[PDB]
Amino acid sequence: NGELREEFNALSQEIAMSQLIDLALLPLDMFSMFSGIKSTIDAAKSMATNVMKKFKKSGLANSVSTLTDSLSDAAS
Amino acid sequence: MASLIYRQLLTNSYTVDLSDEIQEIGS
Amino acid sequence: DVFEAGIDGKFFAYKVDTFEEIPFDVQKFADLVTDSPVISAIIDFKTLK
Amino acid sequence: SIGSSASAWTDVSTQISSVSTQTSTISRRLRLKEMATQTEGM
Amino acid sequence: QNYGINLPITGSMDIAYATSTLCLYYPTEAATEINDNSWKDTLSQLFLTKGWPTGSVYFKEYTNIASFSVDPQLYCDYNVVLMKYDATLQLDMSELADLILNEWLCNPMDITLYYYQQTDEANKWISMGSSCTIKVCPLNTQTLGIGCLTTDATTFEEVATAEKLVITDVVDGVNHKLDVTTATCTIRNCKKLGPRENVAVIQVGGSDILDITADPTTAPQTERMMRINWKKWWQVFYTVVDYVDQIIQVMSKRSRSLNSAAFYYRV
Amino acid sequence: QNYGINLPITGSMDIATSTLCLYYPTEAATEINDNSWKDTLSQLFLTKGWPTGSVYFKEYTNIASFSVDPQLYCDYNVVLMKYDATLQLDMSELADLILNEWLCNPMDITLYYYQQTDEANKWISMGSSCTIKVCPLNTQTLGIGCLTTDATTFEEVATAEKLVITDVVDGVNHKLDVTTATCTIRNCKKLGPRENVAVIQVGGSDILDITADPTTAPQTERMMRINWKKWWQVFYTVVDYVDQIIQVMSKRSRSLNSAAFYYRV
Amino acid sequence: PITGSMLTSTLCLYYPTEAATEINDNSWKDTLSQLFLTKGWPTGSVYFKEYTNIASFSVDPQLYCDYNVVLMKYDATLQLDMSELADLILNEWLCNPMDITLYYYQQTDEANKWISMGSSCTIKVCPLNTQTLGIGCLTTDATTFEEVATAEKLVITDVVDGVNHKLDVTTATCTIRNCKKLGPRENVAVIQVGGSDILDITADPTTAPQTERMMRINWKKWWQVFYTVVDYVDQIIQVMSKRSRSLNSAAFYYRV
Amino acid sequence: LPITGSMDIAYALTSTLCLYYPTEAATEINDNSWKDTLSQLFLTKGWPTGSVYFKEYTNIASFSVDPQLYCDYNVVLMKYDATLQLDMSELADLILNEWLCNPMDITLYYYQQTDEANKWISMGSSCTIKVCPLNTQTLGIGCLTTDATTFEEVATAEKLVITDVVDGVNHKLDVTTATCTIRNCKKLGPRENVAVIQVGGSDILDITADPTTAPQTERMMRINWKKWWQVFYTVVDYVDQIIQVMSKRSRSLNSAAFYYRV
């Protein structure tokens, strides 16, 4: 010993429907999400940690925080 | 149902702080 | 119609109001088990009967 | 495909009686539904 | 899977519808003007960032344009070749463009004993070698001299001199007798079948000068011949890198290379 | 698009310029002892019915030399091959090389290992001198019977040859050590038969294993043997029955350029 | 009678000494076993047996595995020895000992042959008439006989059937037996390394067919042919089949 | 596979025989043609000629070196003594039982036991087996991980050792890997192709490591002697019972070794 946006958007035309509904019936968890993807032992140590750190700064996080703040403020 | 993956994602997120603490020791 | 099947290799079909058997068809069970909610029956078909 | 559509739950993947093995594999694959909280019983 | 006989297909006009290798040929001038040995890994990493698989971008080098034209290499999936414009190498530029932009299905030749003739504007005489000097003498119907003594190989007229590559055409419907020293050069009788879209040529310096078809009636500056200005070869490399996707969109995989044409003409 | 190979073609059970090459060895021409034999052959071919300027003649010095960068020019090829009681392997390899279609890949042994996929992959090395030595490995990249970092104990399969065909048992990677200064090694797979060629031998004993298959040697109608004492007899008997040769083969597999194999990247 | 409606394997190999001489290795067996394990033959089931020369190996042929493949080298001057070896190790010959002292034997059909095995078998033969008078030979003088084979390791002799003959042999270096062909042996496949398929397995000149157990490949290095043989084990096994011989006499066999 | 038959309907050679004898018998008989006499006696009994092979061993210990027999029917005469009973029992248990082994190495790997049907077998010239257990964190108990002197002795100057220790604990082994090789074998079941005829006095030959079990099957026999020809005559004249007490191979996964099945 980039283009991924276009490729991901183009790949999204051929998925089946019945299997999609079947998978949407079975809930996932923190284990099934990454159990089908190969990982490097050095980086698999911090894989859930990084995605959760980036997710706590997501738009949905701001929306839920604002909703909670407005709900608590409404008790005045 | 399958939406639960979102709900857990924001639930245990607090644990990152602990790891972040370790990260600052490793930073 | 209630379709009850196990792991040992036996299956049955019957009716809810009265406990008597009806002929079984694989197609209906295969379609149902894909999406229908499964119930863990502690009291199996033999014991219920 | 045994049933009406080709999905993973009903995919017996039959090798070239039949009801016995088909029910056996359906039962073996059905127990994992208990992890997915797809039950309203015990 | 009936490969041979062409069969009509059928489609629709309303229903919704719809890895490889990349080479590069560059002159020695850029190598002398870059002054960085590890540049190959740099370019490979940049192409990886663009999306191409790493460790799969090949490189070839040549001394000069005329020497590179000697037995050119089609062995690649997307030929993107740069050429330095010269104010005195126009004919070689044109002949190279003709030879590496059209699919030429050729036949063998042996001029020492036989006659030859041509039947169409797709018929051409192509000679490749290190020293080719073509002598041509047309003949009458009764095999008699016309402007040349057939028994001598001197009263002819030279249509080429001191070139590695040459493309010649004669008036269809008459016979000819050829004279050239085949020791350091060979020649073929070839027929231009169809346009090969497996190669792209980008010109640097000068203006639009190429002519891909021998017909005077057309000089089609098609969209597989580009032109850019340059003062630093690194700028040219970067500009080529930034628009690899557009070049790919312009071209396509070699049609003859696909398994579909396994019995028409292999590649 | 795909020339239309998808939609099936259906008919009815009850329905109602060209080039020909001729390859000959040099010593045959030397034994001919003539300077204008080509003109005589041309006139005889014209009397047969071929247009003038259709039959062409090429020369190859030796079986060893010709196998380096083999070339097929005409739409038809009838090669004349001389037999030596010690060159059976080389003759068979040449027949296999210029008798079947191939699709090859380039190789660079200074960086990459190599392996085999199935039983339709062969190794072809061409050049003026090729010496190929192999050293297989276990399931954990360790040499078995050969030190993986020593260039002395590697087993040999090729030496002092111009045309070498190599095969090893699939499922295991290997390392190659060849004098690349005078050789080049490529990985090829056979796509099927080539009908653009035909091989006729003088002498011999009907020994031409055209396939690497040990079980069978499927002799076809494209490989024949003729006895000889003076080469003009062979030339006459091969220009007399030319129509049968033409009927045997076909002109629908012609390649674009003269190359026994199709290069790739 | 039968009615119908519409690992446990071994692989022995034989090779001449000059093959190993070209190989120049004392660990090649381990590597070949490893390759066979990778291809799908469990280790410890491929036994290797080495002979010296065709003539030396002809006497007393032993067949251990259930699927034997032999690499025989072409001999331009000893073709008959190769043919006789192939005929002996390719068909099920049922044999019994024979006497040479005060008896005369005969033949009755094409299946009856005579097999001579020894270190040096110079077998001499002289036919006889009804009145026990020879034709061109004397009943006592050995040199008056007609020599059929001299200085030989293995000879398959066939004489005309229905006529008795006296045989003179060197018993101190050879022995002869009467054999009958009771089936085509299907546990030995001969791969001829070189030559031009010069093997005939029937004494009858009218029919000399080539079966699928007698192959032919070209060679210049023993490692290439060895690799080719190892690679194509599936096809070689598919061509051959199991054994159905009664085996009235028990010999050594290899398993495990 | 299931077998279907009936119990009210009246429902009803070509094998190999190997005789194993000590070389002391050959020395005592002082003859060379007695093999021919035994062959002719068997032919009279009803066995085909040239269908019996004889194998000779120099010593009990020497015969314990890869004792794999090569007959369909096997009966071995075993010498009698009161100072080598352990090795006799080891040989009897290795011959009378079927085993499937795996390669081992002592300088690189650790090993343990988990089922009582698995034991350690070391064969060769001489095996000086020494072993001590470990804990979960790999610290020697009564031994040091590198000291070869504190390791407890379990086998010294033995030509064939069958060892068994407490299961469920990793262990470390030390022996010279140039004079004896060790393999990990499991007892798949009974080997019915062999039988032992202890020519001597009382039997102590145990075929199991379990003390509470003393299996005395019908495949172990005992007889006294004062002349070898008496033993040979008794063996040859009573082939019927000693053959009907055994059976054919019941193996599900056969091994790779020489066999003599004419």
Side-chain angles (χ1 to χ4, degrees), chain F residues 45-176:
Chain F
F45 272 110
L46 170 132
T47 56
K48 181 56 183 57
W50 299 91
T52 315
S54 52
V55 42
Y56 295 78
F57 298 82
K58 289 298 186 179
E59 48 189 356
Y60 69 100
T61 299
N62 193 25
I63 297 93
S65 178
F66 170 76
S67 296
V68 180
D69 264 329
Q71 304 292 274
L72 289 189
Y73 292 87
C74 309
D75 283 353
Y76 296 143
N77 296 134
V78 272
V79 291
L80 290 189
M81 187 179 306
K82 200 167 185 299
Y83 155 81
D84 289 331
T86 175
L87 299 179
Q88 292 73 299
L89 177 136
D90 290 1
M91 288 184 299
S92 61
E93 289 198 10
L94 177 63
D96 203 337
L97 182 66
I98 64 179
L99 242 175
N100 285 330
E101 56 194 9
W102 293 93
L103 184 60
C104 299
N105 296 336
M107 293 174 56
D108 203 327
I109 65 177
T110 57
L111 291 180
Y112 295 90
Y113 300 82
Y114 291 93
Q115 65 157 9
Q116 310 289 311
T117 72
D118 57 69
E119 208 49 50
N121 303 127
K122 274 80 176 178
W123 285 356
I124 295 179
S125 60
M126 304 188 306
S128 181
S129 184
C130 292
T131 57
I132 291 85
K133 309 177 68 178
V134 303
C135 172
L137 302 165
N138 59 5
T139 183
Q140 280 298 328
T141 64
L142 293 181
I144 318 182
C146 42
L147 285 310
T148 178
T149 57
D150 291 356
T152 59
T153 181
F154 287 171
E155 294 76 9
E156 66 172 13
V157 295
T159 171
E161 270 202 1
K162 328 286 285 188
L163 175 56
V164 185
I165 298 183
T166 316
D167 184 13
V168 290
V169 193
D170 321 333
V172 279
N173 305 269
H174 315 281
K175 184 184 178 182
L176 289 74

Side-chain angles (χ1 to χ4, degrees), chain G residues 7 43-45 47 64 246-256, chain H residues 14-16 48 50 53 68 70 254-262:
Chain G
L7 302 185
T43 179
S45 54
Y47 178 86
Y64 303 91
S246 66
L247 274 180
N248 304 24
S249 177
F252 287 160
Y253 285 93
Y254 196 86
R255 291 94 182 87
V256 179
Chain H
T14 325
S15 302
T16 61
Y53 175 82
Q68 180 76 14
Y70 37 83
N254 302 21
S255 304
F258 270 162
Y259 276 86
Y260 173 81
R261 314 173 183 175
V262 187

